[PDB]
Design an enzyme around this catalytic site. Structure first.
Site, PDB file in Angstrom:
ATOM      1  N   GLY A 165       4.035   2.734  -6.740  1.00  0.00           N
ATOM      2  CA  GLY A 165       3.590   1.129  -7.441  1.00  0.00           C
ATOM      3  C   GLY A 165       4.400   0.395  -8.403  1.00  0.00           C
ATOM      4  O   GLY A 165       4.677  -1.116  -8.360  1.00  0.00           O
ATOM      5  N   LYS A 167      -8.698   2.624  -0.621  1.00  0.00           N
ATOM      6  CA  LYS A 167      -7.621   3.805   0.806  1.00  0.00           C
ATOM      7  C   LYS A 167      -8.167   4.645   1.515  1.00  0.00           C
ATOM      8  O   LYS A 167      -7.552   5.263   2.723  1.00  0.00           O
ATOM      9  CB  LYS A 167      -6.624   2.615   1.141  1.00  0.00           C
ATOM     10  CG  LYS A 167      -6.232   1.649   0.077  1.00  0.00           C
ATOM     11  CD  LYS A 167      -4.957   0.984  -0.665  1.00  0.00           C
ATOM     12  CE  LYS A 167      -5.201  -0.539  -0.748  1.00  0.00           C
ATOM     13  NZ  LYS A 167      -2.664  -0.515  -1.134  1.00  0.00           N
ATOM     14  N   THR A 198       1.036  -1.003   0.187  1.00  0.00           N
ATOM     15  CA  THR A 198       0.084  -0.195   0.157  1.00  0.00           C
ATOM     16  C   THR A 198       0.945   1.167   0.096  1.00  0.00           C
ATOM     17  O   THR A 198       1.695   0.953   0.689  1.00  0.00           O
ATOM     18  CB  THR A 198      -1.645   0.162   1.465  1.00  0.00           C
ATOM     19  OG1 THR A 198      -2.072  -1.240   1.313  1.00  0.00           O
ATOM     20  CG2 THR A 198      -2.037   1.101   1.373  1.00  0.00           C
ATOM     21  N   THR A 257       1.896  -3.012  -3.638  1.00  0.00           N
ATOM     22  CA  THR A 257       1.439  -1.433  -4.230  1.00  0.00           C
ATOM     23  C   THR A 257       1.201  -1.499  -5.945  1.00  0.00           C
ATOM     24  O   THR A 257       2.107  -0.909  -6.697  1.00  0.00           O
ATOM     25  CB  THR A 257       1.874   0.517  -4.220  1.00  0.00           C
ATOM     26  OG1 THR A 257       2.591   0.182  -2.594  1.00  0.00           O
ATOM     27  CG2 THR A 257       1.434   1.321  -4.431  1.00  0.00           C
ATOM     28  N   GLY A 283      -7.464   8.330   4.546  1.00  0.00           N
ATOM     29  CA  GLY A 283      -6.318   7.653   4.234  1.00  0.00           C
ATOM     30  C   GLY A 283      -6.268   6.422   4.662  1.00  0.00           C
ATOM     31  O   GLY A 283      -4.261   6.661   5.541  1.00  0.00           O
ATOM     32  N   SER A 315       3.908   0.598   2.186  1.00  0.00           N
ATOM     33  CA  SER A 315       5.402  -0.072   2.829  1.00  0.00           C
ATOM     34  C   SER A 315       6.208   1.169   1.131  1.00  0.00           C
ATOM     35  O   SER A 315       7.279   1.029   0.824  1.00  0.00           O
ATOM     36  CB  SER A 315       5.012  -1.213   1.541  1.00  0.00           C
ATOM     37  OG  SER A 315       3.927  -1.691   0.551  1.00  0.00           O
ATOM     38  N   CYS A 350       6.868  -0.930  -4.935  1.00  0.00           N
ATOM     39  CA  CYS A 350       6.445  -1.454  -4.388  1.00  0.00           C
ATOM     40  C   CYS A 350       5.412  -2.473  -5.359  1.00  0.00           C
ATOM     41  O   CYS A 350       4.963  -2.526  -5.597  1.00  0.00           O
ATOM     42  CB  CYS A 350       5.576  -0.533  -3.388  1.00  0.00           C
ATOM     43  SG  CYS A 350       5.295  -2.311  -1.346  1.00  0.00           S
TER      44      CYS A 350
HETATM   45 MG   LIG Z   1       3.449  -3.001  -8.454  1.00  0.00          MG
END
Ligand SMILES: [Mg+2]
Ligand SMILES: Nc1ncnc2c1ncn2[C@@H]1O[C@H](COP(=O)(O)OP(=O)(O)O)[C@@H](O)[C@H]1O
Ligand SMILES: Nc1ncnc2c1ncn2[C@@H]1O[C@H](COP(=O)(O)OP(=O)(O)O)[C@@H](O)[C@H]1O
Ligand SMILES: Nc1ncnc2c1ncn2[C@@H]1O[C@H](COP(=O)(O)OP(=O)(O)O)[C@@H](O)[C@H]1O
Ligand SMILES: [Mg+2]
Ligand SMILES: [Mg+2]
Ligand SMILES: [Mg+2]
Ligand SMILES: [Mg+2]
Ligand SMILES: [Mg+2]
Ligand SMILES: [Mg+2]
Ligand SMILES: [Mg+2]
Lengths: 173, 299, 299, 173, 299
Positions: free
Chosen positions: D157, D33, D1, D163, D45, D125, D160
């Site tokens: 994104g 979120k 996230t 994400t 959030g 994260s 991670c």
């Molecule tokens: Mg990702």
């Protein structure tokens, strides 16, 4: 974090860095880790976990308000609450408090401890570093108290990866 | 038909040293009882008391003022510790049933102009119990009818004064319905050495005035010397600071710890006169007691 | 034989500013007492009150309406905090025994047309205790007979108005037997600066109307200036927003924090007249008090 | 996230990904979120554990309803509940909340913390990633606030693994 | 109209051995009741008792003095264990309702000069309950009006003596409002072998004086020998030290553990005389009982 305090010639200085470290990253570099209590006549600086440090500080604050600000007393009282019979939360942190009278550090496990004689106190991960520095300086330089502290913190920050350069030095006229 | 907010103050100004705001606060509040009531048909009942919240430490007078204003007002007085209720109605409507008891049973008086003092109200804040009595008191304050063995008595025009040190808690912590019913908030101040000196002699029947009049019974004549008074006072203030600050009651200590000797042997001294000067005082009050080592807990 | 739902409203319209729905709600409810009762043999007893649930914040009037409707209805009124029971029957049938007490003892009146106000009902929801009083109240609402020192009194035709802010809880959280007995649900609204101004002068015996009439006792003549009123109001609304919103009781503060000076020295001013304009008001109400630093808790 | 928020020129943007990761697998890619509170005038959030994040959020919601929505206050209040005396469940999560007044993140351990100055906040994260991105952008581009956020999340994104790309950006006129 | 602080002491000096400070303390306190009251219009009511705090161990006399002073003062006496309240008013205003009961119902007496003894007060310190009774007692001490079946009785002039060992707790642990109302603090001392000897014969109706007078009923004549008394005493002091120190009540043990034999068979001895010397005593009191091995818990 590093929080050190030196006391000499009617001067009492308690200052510390301002870094909040989440794991191996930085939350915020500016943070006031030393603050004023009892109408602003007693100095405080907390170390350890943001949460438990703050909750330690607050508890020391209630005591003061309840004991004409008489530091030493206030401390032993709080300490007592951990020594009673029902083990309180047991906050993992440490506080360095002082005023016109004396200096004193308090762990959140239940004890109050006093300085050697050099009236030097320092908690935090960088403490001992700043300690050494000041423990030195003091023994070899008529540097002010509001001066030793300033330099000792810095010496630390340049060593402890969890201690930055944005200090806050609250002294007590 | 009664004093003025200026005259009342002066009436307290006697028995009480300092605390102007507080003396003043209650000075207004008591005049109004007289202002309204002078009013007409609907407005006599419509205007309600402007209850007070006194904030100050121990023995600085937060209660004397209340107790004295009541006395100069010939009004049904009663004191209750807010905490009395931490844990036929319930135990709280009692504050009125009781007041009416002491009041004699004359409701036409209890309602019209009785006074209530709620001590330690700063003490029932922030735990599910203390924050109940606030609610328990509302009726009492906000206007309520309550049954008593003498008849029905309503708190619509009763005057409420509540005290507190609020060292930890602010009055902003009271429940909002109450903060709204303790409009007027005064602040009595702690007492000083220079103050004690004053309480020590100035008021009506001051400590010295008392011991003096008492020894005068055995056929003794005592005379307090300024310089002595000054010391008695410095004394009180000292220990209050150095140990447990109990306000001005402390004078009642230093006073008795000093008059011990004369108080005893005074019977066998008829005819004599005694002079309490510094050298005397200084010798009845040791200096400091008990090793008072608070170190046995420190590392 | 009594006003009409239009006439009643206008009667409240005086003492209360705003809150149309609420004024209206109770306006109907009170006419019916008159409608039924006019009815025949079986239907006079068969039709029951259509009790109300008021939902609004502090000091917006949820109680005045109730208290005033009762007064214009010469009806046995009583208020009780829903939480009073969080923890000879039990302590709850008392709401009737008490009402009958205040009512005098005339049951033919208590039953026929008494009114009950259950404050803070939104407060006994969602913990095994609060959700008991709902049940404890059912008899009371759903039709019950209860013993009192004056005789048997039944809640079959008593009118029940209950309040609440229901900020956290919705009325949908009450127990279903109750949601069903609080049919009518009105919604009073919070009060605004423009509203205060109105409460400040418009009603019968408005704050200003009061202080004015009081000072008139000392032989003083005060005159409130629109521009001043406007400020007093802006003031109240301010602090309510900025600190703890206590509704309209707040006017009782700003009002007394302003009239302090005149209220005291007014005795020694016979003959004079006083003009409370902006420049005055603006100078009796500091600006903002206490450092109010809420930062000492933040990182 | 990843949940980041930027505030500039009367604009406050708080947006985040939408991936719910169970162990090393994906529960659901679409997840809101960031959401609205207090009649829809304060942005929220949450990060961390679905369970504890939601239970943190809800608790912050009660406070608002109880304090005329005055954010800052509401926060310190909630924080207080952990500092009292009886250590509450101690939810393992984090919330980034803001409105027309200020931005603020709240841990479920008991503290409220404020942004440096760049008015940039980011938990999760992927946070620090989106942080860096925005911390950059802001310092070098007059990009909107509702724009920096959009790009920063994405940058994350793509870094991670927990994400994703299905964002949700709630701004506050 | 009553003894002097010198004369009163001598009156206790009989029934009680040692404890000068304590005997003295109460000696003053009781004279004052007489000093004030002799005073004029306002001062008779203004001066309040200077209540006492006795600090000493078990059976050293902290209560006798209190009970005896009351007897030589023909004053409404009552004792209560501070802890009785650890968990119509409440159960505590009772200390007065009760006193008034024993007092007969003559308030003109209860108020004017009754005495109250609060045993074990050192026991309600430092847990949310024990520290409540302090507060519960304040009214009582600080001046309060209380309802009783005989009428209204106020604690304005009641004398309060409170005891304690305060081994663990100091009096400095009492709540400040109280420390201030227990001005006078005396310190009774523990009792010694040489003391026992004295209590054993000196007082009015001493243990020996009693057993002697009793056996004299069966037609027996007993005579205690100094050397015996000395031993009885050494005995008491011993066991008190070696086991559980119960103060002087211990004499009531060693005494009965010795007089067993004569006490029984004394009926069948009319005419004889008995001599209790050492050799006797030494043989009625074994030496040491039970293996008393406290080792079974040690490693
Ligand atoms: Mg990702
Ligand atoms: N400011 C004062 N002036 C004169 N006497 C005082 C003053 N303050 C306290 N006292 C005395 O001390 C005693 C305690 O009074 P009290 O009103 O109970 O203090 P508090 O209201 O803080 O509890 C009283 O007998 C009173 O006469
Ligand atoms: N809308 C209003 N109009 C006129 N007066 C009001 C209004 N709202 C509150 N007040 C005044 O404020 C005080 C509080 O009234 P209250 O009914 O107890 O508010 P609530 O029902 O929310 O508890 C009363 O004296 C009342 O006259
Ligand atoms: N100092 C003493 N002199 C004479 N008798 C004493 C003395 N101390 C205790 N006693 C006797 O012991 C018994 C216990 O008395 P008590 O006053 O209850 O001791 P305490 O005040 O410590 O509880 C009484 O019958 C009393 O006569
Ligand atoms: Mg570093
Ligand atoms: Mg007090
Ligand atoms: Mg107190
Ligand atoms: Mg209300
Ligand atoms: Mg409310
Ligand atoms: Mg059902
Ligand atoms: Mg005993």
């Amino acid at each position: 974090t590093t929080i050190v305090s030196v006391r000499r010639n009617g001067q009492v200085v308690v200052g510390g860095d301002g870094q909040v470290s989440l794991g191996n990253t930085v939350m915020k570099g500016n943070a006031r880790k030393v603050r004023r209590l009892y109408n602003g006549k007693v100095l405080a600086g907390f170390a350890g976990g943001t949460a438990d440090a703050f909750t330690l500080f607050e508890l020391f604050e209630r005591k003061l308000e309840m004991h004409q600000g008489h530091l030493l007393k206030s401390a032993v009282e709080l300490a007592k609450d951990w020594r009673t019979d029902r083990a309180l939360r047991k906050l993992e942190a440490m506080l360095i408090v002082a005023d016109e009278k004396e200096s004193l550090i308090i762990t959140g496990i239940g004890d109050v401890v006093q300085p050697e004689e050099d009236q030097i106190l320092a908690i935090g991960s960088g403490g001992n570093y700043a300690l050494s520095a000041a423990r030195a300086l003091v023994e070899n330089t008529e540097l002010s108290a509001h001066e030793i502290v300033e330099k000792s913190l810095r010496i630390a920050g340049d060593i402890c990866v969890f201690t930055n350069t944005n200090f806050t030095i609250e002294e007590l006229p | 038909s009664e004093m003025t907010p200026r005259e009342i103050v002066s009436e307290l100004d006697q028995h009480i040293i300092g605390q102007a705001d507080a003396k003043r606060a209650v000075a207004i509040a008591l005049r109004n009882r007289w202002r309204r009531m002078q009013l007409q048909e609907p407005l006599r009942h419509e205007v309600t008391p402007k209850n007070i919240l006194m904030i100050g430490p121990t023995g600085v007078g937060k209660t004397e003022i209340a107790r004295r204003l009541a006395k100069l007002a010939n009004a049904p007085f009663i004191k209750v510790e807010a905490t009395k209720f931490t844990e036929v109605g319930k135990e709280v409507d009692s504050i009125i049933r009781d007041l009416t008891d002491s009041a004699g049973g004359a409701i036409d008086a209890v309602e019209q102009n009785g006074i209530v003092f709620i001590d330690e109200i700063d003490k029932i804040c922030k735990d599910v119990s203390r924050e109940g009595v606030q609610r328990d008191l509302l009726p009492l304050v906000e206007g309520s009818t309550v049954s008593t063995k003498h008849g029905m008595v309503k708190t619509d025009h009763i005057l409420f004064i509540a005290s507190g040190a609020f060292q930890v808690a602010r009055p902003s912590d009271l429940i909002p319905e109450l903060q709204g019913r303790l409009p007027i908030r005064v602040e009595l101040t702690a007492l000083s050495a220079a103050d004690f000196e004053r309480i020590l002699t100035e008021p009506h029947a001051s400590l010295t005035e008392q011991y003096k009049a008492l020894m005068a019974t055995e056929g003794v004549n005592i005379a307090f010397t300024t310089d002595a008074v000054k010391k008695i006072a410095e004394a009180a203030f000292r220990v209050n600071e150095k140990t447990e600050n109990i306000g001005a009651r402390r004078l009642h200590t230093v006073m008795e710890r000093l008059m011990d000797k004369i108080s005893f042997s005074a019977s066998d001294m008829n005819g004599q006169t005694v002079n309490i000067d510094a050298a005397y005082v200084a010798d009845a009050l040791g200096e400091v007691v008990e090793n008072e080592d608070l170190s046995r807990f420190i590392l």
